[PDB]
Design a protein around this ligand. Structure first.
Ligand SMILES: [Mg+2]
Ligand SMILES: [Zn+2]
Ligand SMILES: [Zn+2]
Ligand SMILES: [Zn+2]
Ligand SMILES: [Zn+2]
Length: 1113
């Protein structure tokens, strides 16, 4: 089979009828237990392909039930709508019994004075139903002292398996000659009279005893019982391990596992436990031992079991989301846990199921008996019986002795269900699609090793089974029973559930009263202040069209939130930049959200509010410095000719998207204000599902071959890797996204919630679903963090210059981009043609060579450089050769999509056609577009006399950067350049303190020679770290060549993270010193050489300073 590379399903190399459901059309099964790749590191197939498979097999419904999550619900919805297959939305939850009693036969005896027969049993196994006691020990204890002892051996007819001979120190001879049970049971019944039975895991030992009793018609002997396991859990929740040995060790009790020892050990503890129960609490009787049960962290110590929960109706889906959210947020231990009481409250619209062999019913039937399974099954709505293979690992694990006993377990479960009038269904616990895939799942598990108990044994065959396979597998039950539990009951369960929709259809934005009016008032107030009450026609038309598009579509909330966030940012003294197309909005400019002005190049008078508008000038900043005609003030200039259609789309029917680069420091404050704005219960950090990628998958595959010692063709490694790829590995938060839920709706109408990476200490909750499926229905606010706003603010603190006052039309920043002669350093010295090292977006070697080659000296030319840099194929094979060959200037070449549109409309082409042409070129689809469309575009361009090179340039373009983000980058660059060109020490301090994280401090402090040698090493090389060090070292060499110097870290002159300035030397932060740490840095700031070492706690860092000359000081 060609998987890229041809696979025979046996091996791989480097140079078919699909599975069919043969059942009749109406007699197809419904698969009710499906695990997708959203079950963390458990299943490997996407829900989409499972749903597609089901749609080819004619099943009328399928159920998605992942392990503790619903993260495959949106993809499942899409797949079910494509395949015409009904989706039942469920989860495989880990449910913990809320209340597990400590005392079993409630009685009003006094614990301090009662007689305890602390007993124990050696066994042939764990299943009281299919294995028997091989020994019986007990110690009658009083007042904490032993009174009597009863130890006996019981001989099973079969020889003891080597497992028992080892687990239990009992051999066949050891019990070769022993009394019959009937007799040993009667002896223990008389011995255990008028006493309080005691056991560790008293459920296990009481079930065995009662089963043995019932084997001879002996009375059940229901005297009061105590389970030391539960008592220890309740009394010492602090412990995380409660096994006898562990507990015996903790409380200093000695044990080798022979029943006699076990018994004496439990007794030596049980005395302590009962004393603690009587003293530390008010439990002086047996009954009082059960009063406080299932209260508190009880969920944390309980052992979860698998349950299947299916949403009955849309209310049921909301309830499943609330249960998933609570299991993630309130009842999480090493897994999302649902207390059984919570599942009972919310079950009117939930069909609860018995799940798999890890369920309560299968566990009870295989280890406790039909009556316990019949009582537990009372709580479920349907019973799940899987084909024997799924239960095959149990036989290999020796839980079920043979195929005869396993057939007895499945048949009993079918009967118990008919008896209680419950739907019994065959499910399949599907974890993969076809059987060739099994190895896919096996290669994924092996990676976890001892973490996954599934490794201890072999994995089952959990593959989607056709209807006939399931029917044939359960045929062992009978003919009118297999067809019932496979086809009829499953379809009955499917018909019970009403159609559910997990994802909404429209966008639900928050409501702020007076938002449209507020946005209009802000925009018009700013416009009047900048251009006068008799507003110019151009600005009038722009504002009217923008505001009609915004307020008309109900998007004023997006702009209003953006405005409040940016205003608060300004009040704290932080500039907010933007990413995307928000700068294309003049309402965004006037409301203060953006600093880019999308208007046409224009002059405006600061005092008269006069105005003149112009495509002769590419941008207003690139215009003569004229003086106001009306008065003597220097006319201000602005405008970058950015249409709003790029942001609000043609016709303005598009949802505004405002990504704001707030400072890295202030992002927390911004998110907290988004909470204040909408409430702590309606804002959630966005969520991302980190999965396994091919590098990791290849690693896991190679690890399997090494561990199992099997060679694979390299191509087989490749095929196996492409198959373990896409499996959920973890969950994360988006870098700065926040999702807001309308106060007239709750999060559960959209998604469950959780903590990122399941960290319960997280200050924010994330959405359970991907932001990629909830962002078309609720507002996703991108409050991103960027280092640029952190640099400008510190430069303002260091210099006082208000950032806005800085002029971006300076006549020396163009010089910075032409050459370093403005800086006062030679190209030979700074090792770069342009003195733009460290100017945001203008210091990468590639972009620096682009500048050296084209020598731009205008704001429009700098925008073209930024576009050439963030566009694929727009330059290396496009405008780099059109410029070197001399065909076109830097200004003429295509650099941004908005530039494409403006030029096509600067020429006679109609605006609508250009928008279409701009979109086509932006999406790298010009080649893809059919000749009819390409011909319309070509004819229009030629009629407007479009230069022939332009069309050729368009054909090779892939992705083109937006013009507004480019203008933001260029403004930040020009402000940081003002300081670099005018106030160098301040610029250098800000850059290092905010961006530089890796300093070869000793080399930088030594002088130029050292930095030069260090750069050579990197030049000869290299790891990401080496190149980061090389960028910091290059800025260091520029600063050193400029006469400024660095200083060694000073105990009384070094800030923890920020460089300090004295003359032309920046004192260095403690953070820079190799691994001086950040917490250690803060501690030093808070504060003999030994005394300093103490405040810091590291001897190794003390040795560093002792060698670099601070400790010498
Ligand atoms: Mg025991
Ligand atoms: Zn699983
Ligand atoms: Zn399960
Ligand atoms: Zn399962
Ligand atoms: Zn004027």
């Amino acid at each position: 089979y060609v998987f890229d590379k041809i696979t025979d399903y046996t091996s791989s190399f480097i140079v078919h009828t699909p599975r069919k459901d043969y059942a009749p059309e109406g007699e197809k099964r419904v698969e009710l237990h499906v695990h997708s790749n959203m079950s963390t590191m458990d299943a490997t197939n996407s829900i989409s392909d499972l749903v597609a498979q089901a749609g080819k097999w004619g099943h009328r419904a399928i159920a998605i039930t992942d392990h503790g999550g619903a993260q495959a619900f949106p993809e499942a919805h899409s797949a079910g709508k494509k395949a015409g297959v009904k989706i039942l939305y469920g989860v495989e939850a880990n449910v913990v019994d809320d209340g597990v009693p400590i005392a079993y036969n409630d009685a009003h005896e006094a614990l301090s004075e009662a007689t305890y027969v602390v007993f124990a049993v050696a066994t042939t196994g764990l299943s009281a139903v299919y294995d028997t006691i091989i020994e019986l020990a007990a110690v009658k204890m009083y007042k904490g002292n032993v009174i009597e002892s009863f130890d006996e051996f019981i001989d099973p007819g079969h020889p003891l398996s080597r497992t028992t001979v080892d687990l239990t120190g009992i051999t066949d001879g050891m019990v070769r000659g022993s009394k019959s049970e009937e007799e040993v049971l009667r002896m223990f019944l008389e011995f255990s009279k008028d006493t309080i039975l005691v056991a560790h895991n008293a459920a296990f030992d009481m079930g065995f005893l009662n089963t043995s009793y019932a084997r001879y018609g002996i009375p059940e002997a229901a005297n009061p019982v105590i389970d030391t396991l539960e008592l220890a859990r309740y009394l010492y929740p602090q412990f995380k391990r409660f096994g006898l040995g562990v507990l015996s060790k903790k409380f200093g009790v000695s044990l080798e596992h022979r029943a006699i020892y076990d018994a004496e050990a439990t007794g030596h503890l049980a005395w302590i436990f009962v004393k603690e129960a009587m003293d530390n609490h008010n439990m002086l009787y047996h009954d009082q031992l059960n009063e406080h049960i299932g209260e508190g962290d009880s969920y944390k110590r309980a052992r979860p079991f698998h349950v299947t929960i299916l949403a009955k109706n849309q209310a049921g889906l909301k309830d499943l989301f609330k249960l998933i959210s609570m299991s993630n947020v309130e009842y999480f231990e090493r897994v999302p846990r649902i207390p059984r009481s919570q599942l009972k409250k919310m079950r009117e619209n939930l069909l609860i199921g018995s799940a798999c062999d890890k369920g309560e019913i299968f566990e009870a039937m295989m280890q406790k008996g039909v009556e316990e399974a019949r009582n537990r099954a009372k709580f479920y709505d349907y019973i799940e019986v899987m084909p024997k293979a799924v239960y095959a690992p149990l036989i290999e694990q020796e839980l079920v002795k043979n195929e005869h006993d396993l057939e007895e377990i499945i048949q009993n479960l079918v009967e118990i269900g008919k008896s209680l009038d419950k739907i019994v269904v065959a499910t399949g616990n599907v974890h993969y699609l076809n059987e060739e895939d099994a190895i896919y799942r096996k290669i994924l598990i092996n990676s976890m090793g001892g973490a996954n108990p599934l490794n201890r044994h072999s994995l089952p065959d959990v593959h989607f089974r056709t209807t006939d396979e399931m029917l044939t597998a359960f045929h062992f039950l009978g003919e009118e029973t297999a067809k019932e539990i496979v086809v009829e009951n499953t379809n009955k369960i499917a018909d019970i559930c009403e159609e559910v929709i997990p994802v909404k259809d429209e966008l639900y934005t928050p409501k702020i009263p007076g938002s449209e009016d507020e946005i209009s008032e802000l925009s018009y107030t700013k416009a009047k202040q900048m251009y006068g009450d008799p507003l110019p026609e151009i600005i009038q038309k722009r504002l009217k069209k923008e505001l009609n598009s915004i307020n008309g579509n109900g998007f004023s909330v997006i702009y209003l939130i953006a405005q409040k966030l940016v205003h608060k940012s300004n009040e704290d003294g932080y500039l907010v930049g933007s990413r995307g197309s928000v700068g294309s909005s003049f309402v965004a400019t006037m409301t203060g959200i953006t600093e880019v002005n999308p208007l046409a190049p224009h002059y405006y008078c600061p005092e008269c509010q006069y105005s003149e508008f112009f495509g002769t000038y590419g941008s207003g900043f690139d215009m003569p410095e004229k003086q106001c005609p009306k008065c003597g003030a220097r006319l201000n200039k602005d405008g970058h000719d950015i249409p709003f259609e790029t942001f609000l789309g043609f016709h303005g029917d598009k949802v505004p998207d405002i990504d704001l680069n707030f400072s890295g420091d202030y992002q927390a404050e911004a998110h907290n204000y988004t909470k204040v704005l909408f409430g702590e219960d309606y804002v959630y950090r966005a969520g991302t599902i980190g999965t396994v990628a091919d590098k990791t998958a290849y690693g896991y595959v190679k690890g399997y071959e090494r561990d199992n010692n099997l060679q694979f063709r390299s191509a087989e490694v490749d095929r196996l890797a492409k198959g373990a790829t896409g499996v959920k590995r973890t969950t994360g938060q988006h870098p700065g996204g926040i999702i807001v839920i309308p106060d007239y709706m709750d999060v559960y109408d959209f998604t469950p919630i959780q903590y990122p990476a399941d960290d319960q200490n997280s200050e924010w909750k994330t959405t359970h679903f991907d932001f990629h499926s909830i962002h078309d229905n609720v507002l996703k606010l991108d409050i991103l963090g960027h280092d640029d706003p952190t640099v400008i603010r510190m430069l303002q603190d260091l210099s006082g210059i208000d950032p806005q006052t800085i002029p971006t039309d300076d006549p020396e920043v163009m010089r910075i981009f032409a050459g370093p002669e403005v800086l006062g350093v030679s190209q030979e010295q700074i090792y770069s043609k342009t003195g733009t090292l460290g100017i945001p977006e203008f210091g990468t070697r590639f972009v620096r060579g682009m500048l050296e080659e084209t020598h731009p000296t205008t704001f429009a030319e700098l925008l073209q450089i930024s576009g050439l840099s963030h566009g694929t194929d727009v330059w290396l094979g496009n405008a780099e050769e059109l410029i070197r060959r001399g065909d076109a200037t830097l200004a003429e070449v295509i650099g941004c999509r908005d530039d494409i549109m403006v030029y096509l409309i600067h020429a006679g082409l109609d605006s609508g056609m250009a928008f279409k042409i701009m979109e086509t070129v932006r999406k790298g689809q010009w080649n893809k577009i059919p000749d009819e469309l390409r011909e319309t575009y070509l004819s229009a361009m030629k009629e407007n006399n479009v230069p022939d090179w332009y069309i050729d340039s368009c054909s090779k373009i892939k992705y083109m950067f937006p013009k507004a983000h480019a203008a933001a980058y260029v403004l930040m660059a020009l402000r940081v350049a003002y300081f670099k060109v005018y106030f160098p020490i301040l610029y250098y301090c800000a850059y290092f303190s905010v961006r530089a994280d890796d300093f070869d401090l000793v080399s930088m402090c030594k002088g130029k020679d050292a930095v030069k040698q260090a750069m050579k090493e990197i030049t000869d090389k290299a790891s990401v770290k080496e190149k980061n060090q090389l960028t910091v070292l290059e800025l260091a060499n520029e600063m050193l060549e400029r006469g400024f110097k660095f200083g060694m870290i000073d105990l009384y002159k070094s800030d923890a993270v920020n460089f300090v300035i004295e003359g032309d030397t920046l004192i260095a932060p403690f953070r820079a010193v190799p691994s001086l740490g950040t917490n250690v840095a803060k501690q030093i700031v808070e504060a003999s050489k030994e005394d300093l070492a103490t405040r810091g706690k590291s001897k190794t860092l003390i040795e560093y300073m002792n060698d670099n000359g601070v400790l010498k000081d």
